[PDB]
Design a protein around this ligand. Sequence first.
Ligand code: HEM
Ligand code: HEM
Ligand SMILES: N[C@@H](CCCNO)C(=O)O
Lengths: 206, 202
Amino acid sequence: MHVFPRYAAARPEQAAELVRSNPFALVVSAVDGVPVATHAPVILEGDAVEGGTLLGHMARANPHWRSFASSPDVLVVFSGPHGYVSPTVYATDPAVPAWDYAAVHATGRVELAEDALDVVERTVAALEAPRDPAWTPTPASRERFRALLPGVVAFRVRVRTEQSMFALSQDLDAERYARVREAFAADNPGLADLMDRSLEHHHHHH
Amino acid sequence: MHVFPRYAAARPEQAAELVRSNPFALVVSAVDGVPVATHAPVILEGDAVEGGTLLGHMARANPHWRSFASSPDVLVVFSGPHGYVSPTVYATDPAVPAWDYAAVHATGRVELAEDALDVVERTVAALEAPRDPAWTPTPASRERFRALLPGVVAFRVRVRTEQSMFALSQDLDAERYARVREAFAADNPGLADLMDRSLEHH
Ligand code: HEM
Ligand code: HEM
Ligand SMILES: N[C@@H](CCCNO)C(=O)O
C-alpha cells in the first residue's frame, strides 16, 4: 500500500481506532509468489497497531494456516467505510471520479497461538462490546466452545509495520467537500461519520 | 480462501454478479515473500470470472505495480456486503457468533497495460452505469484525463482460478434464518438484499 501524503493519518490513534472498529479482516500470506487470503475476525492487543499484536482464528479445515508454521510475514488488511465519489456530486467541470475509503495494513510475523480458547473468547468479548446488550456466553455456550475447539486454528501476528490510508476527500475545496459529505450522509452514514471524525485534526502542511 | 461446500456459489453467474457489483477491490502480489496490497477499482471483461480478464489502475507513485513487470500471479479480492451475526439475534442457547459475508477471490497472471487511457475510461463507464443520472466525461474532463496519464499505471489480470464464498446463513433452520434476515433488514439492507438474491440461485 502506498500512503499518499494528503491521505495520511494525523495520529496513530486513528489507525488503532479503525482496526478495533472493523475486526473482520483479510489475512494474507504468500507461498511461492501466490497470495492466499482468508477472511477472519482479528483483534488488536495493545494501544498502537505498529509494535502491537493481532489475534485471530480460522478453520483448521482451511489449509491456509499450514503456511504459518514457518512463521513467515503476513499482511492483515483492516477496511473501514468506503464509497464511490461520482463527479455528478462535484457539479464542476473538468472533474475526475474518486473512491473514498479508509484502511489499515498491518505487516508482521505470524505464529500459531497456543491458547485458541482465549483467542476466540477474547474475540467474542471485543465484537460484543460495542453492542447493547452485549451477549455474554453462558456455561452451555462455553461448553460448546470447548467442544468446537479442535476445529479451530488460532494465530498471533506481531506487527512490524503499519500503513494507514484515510482517502476522505480532504484535498477537495471546502465547497466540493461539503457536497461529497452531504451526499454520503444519505445511505452511507458510516462514511460521513468517518469523514467528520477524520477532519478534526488533519495533517495538512505537515 | 477455503470455500466450505455449504457456502459455495450456486451458479457461476453469482460470482460474476458480485465482482461487477463491487468493483473497489484489493489487488495483492508477493514482493520478497511479503504480501503487498492496493485498493483499486477493477472491472471484469467477459461473462465469467474464471477465464475472464480483470482491468484496473493504480498510481505510478505506488511502487506496487513494479512487481507486475515480471507478470507474476496476482490475487484480486472482491468483497460484497457483510455483517456480524450476534447470538443475541439467534435467541438460542447454546450459541456461537458468526460473520456473514460474500467474496470472490480471482488469481491469475498480471500484465502491465499500454492502453491506460482505455482502462480508466472503461472504468468510468462501468462505475457510472448504475447511477441515474450517469456522468459522461466532457471534452475538458477527457483532456484532464490525458494530462493525468503520466501519473497512472494500468494493468490486466487473466484469471486462472476463482474461489467464491457466499456465507449467508443459508445453513440455518427456517426460524433462525428469519431472525438473521430480519436483523439485517435494519441498518445492513445491502446484506439483506444479498441474502434474498442468494436464495434459490443467482
Ligand atoms: C466472536 C465472533 C466470531 C466470529 C466473527 C467468527 C468467525 C469465523 C470465521 C469467518 C471462520 C472461517 C475462517 C476460515 O474461512 O477459515 C471461523 C471458523 C471457525 N471458528 Fe469462529 N468466529 C467467532 C467466534 C468463535 C468461537 C467462540 C468459537 C469457539 C471455539 C469459534 C470456532 C470456530 C470454528 C470451529 C471454526 C471452523 C468452522 C468450520 O470448520 O466450519 N469461533 N470463525
Ligand atoms: C472511474 C473511477 C475511478 C476511480 C474509482 C479511481 C480510483 C483511484 C484510486 C483508488 C487510486 C489510488 C491507487 C493507489 O493506491 O495506487 C487512483 C489513482 C490514480 N488514478 Fe484513478 N480512479 C478513477 C478514474 C480515473 C481516471 C479517469 C483517471 C484519468 C487518467 C485516473 C487517474 C489516476 C491517477 C493519475 C492516479 C494517481 C494519483 C496520485 O498519484 O496522486 N483515475 N485512482
Ligand atoms: N491526481 C488525480 C487523482 C484522481 C484519479 N483517481 O481517482 C487528482 O488530481 O485528483
